[PDB]
Ligand binder design. Structure first.
Ligand SMILES: [Zn+2]
Ligand SMILES: [Zn+2]
Ligand SMILES: [Zn+2]
Ligand SMILES: [Zn+2]
Lengths: 133, 72, 187, 585, 186
């Protein structure tokens, strides 16, 4: 889309020295201790996400045994019998957080709150009915 | 004692990153490799020389005033 | 709550109360005096409790329709932004090399992934190492997508210019090496 | 979070309408809002009603509730007013002393800097209020520079002459060297600097620092810069010692430098020394003399303008090792014979607004008369030194005050150093004047130097004065006296040897007219300071306070080394002038 | 809740009721001294309720704000606190290999590239004067980073070569002084 590619880095993470000094004063983090630091903030160089796409490289086209798959799907459907579901109107939707990003285009103009106020319930229902055909 | 080395490596990479080191791709790559590998070490006899290699990076610039900041 | 009519009734009942209390007539006379104020304290009650609870709902209404107006202005702003973005990105379409390939379709439908392949006028290759540079982007002109492209600009990871003479085998370790080479479709 | 300007008490309340946003303690802030027009209170968040669509910004109408600040109309039931009990609620409320009188701070923070009284309060108040006054005066000047309109090059008639179209609805700045513009090149979506320029009436005659080929589109605006906060005082505390402290005088000195040896020792006897230097007395001779007198001392030479510090470098190059000297230049063509941007060198030369953070054995202030309390405070915040040497002259010109319109600024109000030496007297004084002949020296000694200025030369018999009112004409921002120029022209015909003289006048328009009529080089009195010529011709051109400035007139007629001609309009200064008088031809 | 006037009113009412109870006066008269007494708590246990809520609004308003005066101040001084903490921990570490280069860099000797760990790679160091040249280099060896590095090259700041025996004290000024030195790990 742009004339230049972008390289994204990851920051090393901050250190809370006072807590570590308090813990060390309490006889923690000695040699030969059953507890030790194993969780940290790891930093990354410029090529990080484009290195994660070569992990989506792992997906392969697979043909499944159709008869066994059909029987298995019929059996699996019985673990979801106690539940209920269906479509609801735009009135009944419950959104947890309205301060999250709306995506590729649309992040250049606001958060998800802006696009949920702007459109009324009728517009949302019209979009949903459009998506059905 | 290895915890001391890991924590000071974290602090050194933090100050290096905030000195705008990551504006040079390969230097930042080498610093990140050293910092990530020090955190994964299991003996104090390799973390120390990787730590000294990582400190030689900061001792090469001219943004950190050293004589003043080792006021003791 | 002072400009209410019941304040006058309360005040006049209290004035008569204090006047006759200083006079001090009798209980048989002050009974009506101390009952009239006892019902006047009950009137001002009603109407003063019928008023100060409407100032809250009026304030809430003003705030709510303030908020709705703000939302309706933001909607117009985002509408204009989206429409102008569409109209400015349409103007790069190169509307002559795309019309020809569209008109050759049996139905007019063509896959999206072949639109930039046969119409776009700029190519940007990303090169991880010198060996991959040798097989793909060698020389000042190369070929890709059954077309011939000619190099114009090369940059490194730091977005600084690199001349084509610096990309050697022995000088490779001194380069940031996601090299971005941009070129134009030649004719 | 900061410190109350009147109490030093820790506080977070800043007067919101007050331009420099000073920290004011709760009692101080309460008095400042109740006694002035300042009603905005700035704290960590503003004490502004956070209800939608409200404009209430006065703290005396605000109530704190829930977790926010509301106006009375929008407030919740439970709250206590932000402004109550003679104080404003905020940080560090308990730790608060207050001040008995808030009049001086109110006067400074409310003045438009157009009266001499504002400057007298600014230079006679407390040190902290002195600093605040300097900050607000410089900020007011910076904003007033923005009040002038944009001048755009419509037509390039020729070289050194332009045609300018000015912005509508905004005033046009006066066209003199005191108003330094800057060009801007029109680009696709932005602007780029093309240098600094000065303008004068023609069309308009322009003199840019860097020559260019500007065309239609370029525009000029007076460059403004961010006004920094002050922390250090205008003067460090005075300390008197029994010996020379932190310095080692040399055992071998030359007779060029012997006269100031006693003054060089006094520099070592006190923390700071104030030095007054008459015209042609060797102010550069002295200050560079402190360098060789104390060879091992590290000395930083500082001055307000690029010109003086370069002249110090020129005299330093004559007497000091080139390898131990450095010229600091910010990222204007200046001295370029020393190594550039070497802070740690023994001898450091730089201006006020570009000095680095460093320490030195001695710090030399030159040209202190053009210095303000702002420049005094800034360097002291930048340089910490064992000894401090201020060189300047009260009888010379100050830094121009554009906003000043009412009254005259006396030398004892230019800055803190000028105030002391005008009251307690200069710490040292050089009594020998080497440039002008005795007649100018005797005239300027009585006028401004308490008859303390002695001459080195004898009487030259070429100092000549004439009383001639002439006819005074006014253009947009200056004055012209053509008959006064015509008298000079008649003088030149009868005295052809006077055509090597330099024409000086307090007005640029007078210089512009005289340049085309007489052909002599022209200089304004303000720009003539620090120069010298063999002969000069001076035309007062008016009797205004600008022309009758006893500091300016001291500067005006003292640029001549041999002879002088003074065509005078003011009778008072004419009588004071001990020159040979003429009759009008 | 003691410094209020309706406190004095409540105190007067309490004294009057105490007198009434201790005297055993009447049945309706003490009802009058409890009529204007239990109401005295209806304009006391109320006006001493909004104000008592107001005070806790205060102490905790003064708190959501010290910690913002603090939060917005702490993220505005990162560049010095981080550096001072770094050097404090580095000094506390007390390692000789780190301390050697710390002192060399504080006075004169900064390297021009990352110190290599392999026994092959090149190291380029900047020597500013001869005094450090005495402390670090002795003949054809170079002790730096608690390791031994053999010199292969020394060139002055004017990019001119120099040999390993001229360097002395009689050609003290006959050498440019920012010497650079190339070495290989032994
Ligand atoms: Zn459905
Ligand atoms: Zn104010
Ligand atoms: Zn105060
Ligand atoms: Zn409001």
């Amino acid at each position: 889309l742009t004339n230049n590619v972008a390289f994204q880095t990851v920051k090393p993470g901050n250190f809370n020295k006072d807590f570590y000094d308090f813990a060390v004063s309490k006889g923690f983090f000695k040699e030969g201790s059953s507890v030790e630091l194993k969780h940290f903030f790891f930093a990354q160089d410029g090529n990080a996400a484009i290195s994660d796409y070569d992990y989506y490289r792992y997906n392969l086209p697979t043909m499944c045994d159709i008869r066994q798959l059909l029987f298995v799907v019929e059996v699996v459907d019985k673990y979801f019998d106690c539940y209920d579901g269906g479509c609801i109107n735009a009135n009944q939707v419950i959104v947890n957080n309205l301060d999250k990003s709306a995506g590729f285009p649309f992040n250049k103009w606001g958060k998800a709150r802006l696009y949920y106020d702007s459109m009324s319930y009728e517009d949302q229902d019209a979009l949903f009915a459009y998506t059905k055909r | 004692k290895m915890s001391d080395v890991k924590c000071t490596s974290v602090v050194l990479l933090s100050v290096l990153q905030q000195l705008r080191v990551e504006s040079s791709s390969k230097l930042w790559a080498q610093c990140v490799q050293l910092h990530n590998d020090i955190l994964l070490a299991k003996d104090t006899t390799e973390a120390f020389e990787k730590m000294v290699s990582l400190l030689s990076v900061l001792l090469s610039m001219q943004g950190a005033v050293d004589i003043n900041k080792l006021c003791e | 709550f002072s400009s209410l009519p019941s304040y006058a009734a309360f005040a006049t009942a209290q004035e008569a109360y204090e006047q006759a209390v200083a006079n001090g007539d009798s209980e048989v006379v002050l009974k009506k005096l101390k009952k009239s104020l006892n019902v006047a304290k009950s009137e001002f009650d009603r109407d003063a409790a019928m008023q100060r609870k409407l100032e809250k709902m009026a304030d809430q209404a003003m705030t709510q329709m303030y908020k709705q107006a703000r939302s309706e202005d933001k909607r117009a702003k985002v509408t204009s932004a989206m429409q102008t973005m569409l109209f400015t990105m349409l103007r790069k379409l190169d509307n002559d090399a795309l019309n020809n390939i569209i008109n050759n379709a049996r139905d007019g439908c063509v896959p999206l992934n072949i639109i930039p392949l046969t119409t776009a006028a700029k190519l940007m290759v990303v090169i991880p190492d010198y060996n991959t540079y040798k097989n793909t982007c060698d020389g000042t002109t190369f070929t890709y997508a059954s077309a011939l492209w000619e190099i114009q600009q090369v940059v490194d990871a730091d977005s600084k210019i690199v001349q084509l003479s610096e990309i050697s085998m022995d000088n490779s370790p001194n380069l940031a090496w996601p090299l971005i080479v941009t070129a134009l479709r030649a004719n | 979070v900061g410190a109350c300007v009147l109490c030093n008490s820790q506080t977070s309340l800043r007067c919101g309408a007050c331009i420099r946003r000073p920290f004011l303690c709760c009692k101080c802030c309460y008095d400042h809002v109740i006694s002035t027009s300042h009603k905005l209170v700035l704290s960590v968040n503003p004490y502004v009603c956070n209800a939608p669509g409200c404009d209430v910004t006065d703290v005396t109408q605000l109530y704190l509730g829930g977790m926010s600040y509301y106006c009375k109309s929008h407030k919740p039931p439970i709250s206590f007013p932000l402004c109550a009990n003679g104080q404003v609620f905020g940080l560090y409320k308990n730790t608060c002393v207050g001040s008995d009188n808030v009049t001086d701070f109110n006067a400074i923070a409310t003045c438009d800097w157009t009266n001499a009284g504002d400057y007298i309060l600014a230079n006679t108040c407390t040190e902290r209020l002195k600093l605040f006054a300097a900050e607000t005066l410089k900020a007011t000047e910076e904003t007033f520079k923005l009040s002038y309109g944009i001048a755009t090059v419509r037509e390039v008639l020729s070289d050194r002459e332009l045609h300018l179209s000015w912005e509508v609805g905004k005033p046009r700045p006066p066209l003199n060297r005191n108003y330094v513009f800057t060009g801007y090149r029109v680009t696709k979506n932005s602007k780029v600097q093309i240098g600094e320029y000065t303008f004068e009436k023609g069309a308009v005659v322009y003199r840019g620092t860097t020559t260019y080929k500007l065309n239609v589109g370029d525009y000029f605006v007076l460059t403004s810069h961010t006004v920094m906060p002050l922390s250090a005082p205008t003067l460090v505390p005075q300390e008197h010692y029994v010996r020379i402290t932190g310095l080692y005088p040399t055992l071998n000195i030359s007779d060029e430098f012997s006269s100031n040896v006693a003054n060089y020792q006094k520099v070592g006897m006190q923390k700071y020394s104030t030095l007054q230097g008459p015209p042609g007395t060797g102010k550069s001779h002295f200050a560079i003399g402190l360098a060789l007198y104390y060879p091992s001392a590290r000395i930083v030479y500082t001055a307000c303008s690029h010109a003086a510090v370069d002249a110090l470098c020129e005299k330093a190059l004559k007497y000091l090792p080139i390898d131990k000297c450095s010229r600091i230049i910010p990222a204007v063509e200046c001295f370029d014979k020393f190594k550039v941007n070497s802070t740690l060198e023994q001898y450091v030369f730089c201006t006020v607004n570009a000095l680095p953070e460093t320490t030195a054995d001695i710090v030399v202030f030159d040209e202190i008369s053009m210095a303000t309390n702002y420049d005094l405070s800034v360097v002291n915040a930048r340089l910490r030194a064992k000894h401090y040497v201020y060189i300047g002259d009260p009888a010379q010109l100050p830094a121009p005050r554009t906003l000043l319109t009412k009254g005259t600024l006396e030398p004892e109000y230019f800055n803190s150093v000028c105030r002391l030496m005008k009251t307690i007297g200069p710490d040292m004084f050089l009594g020998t004047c080497r440039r002008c002949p005795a007649e100018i020296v005797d005239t300027v000694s009585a006028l401004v130097y308490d008859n303390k200025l002695k001459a080195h030369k004898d009487k030259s018999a070429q100092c000549f004065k004439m009383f001639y009112k002439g006819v005074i004409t006014h253009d947009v921002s200056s004055a012209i006296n053509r008959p006064q120029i015509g008298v000079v022209r008649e003088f030149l015909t009868r005295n052809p040897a006077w055509r090597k003289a330099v024409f000086i006048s307090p007005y640029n328009s007078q210089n512009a007219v005289a340049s085309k009529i007489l052909g002599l080089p022209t200089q304004t009195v303000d720009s003539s300071q620090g120069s010298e010529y063999d002969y000069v011709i001076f035309t007062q051109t008016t009797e205004t306070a600008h022309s009758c400035n006893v500091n300016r007139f001291n500067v005006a007629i003292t640029r001549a080394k041999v002879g002088i001609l003074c065509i005078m309009s003011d009778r008072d200064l004419y009588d004071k002038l001990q020159f040979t008088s003429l009759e009008i031809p």
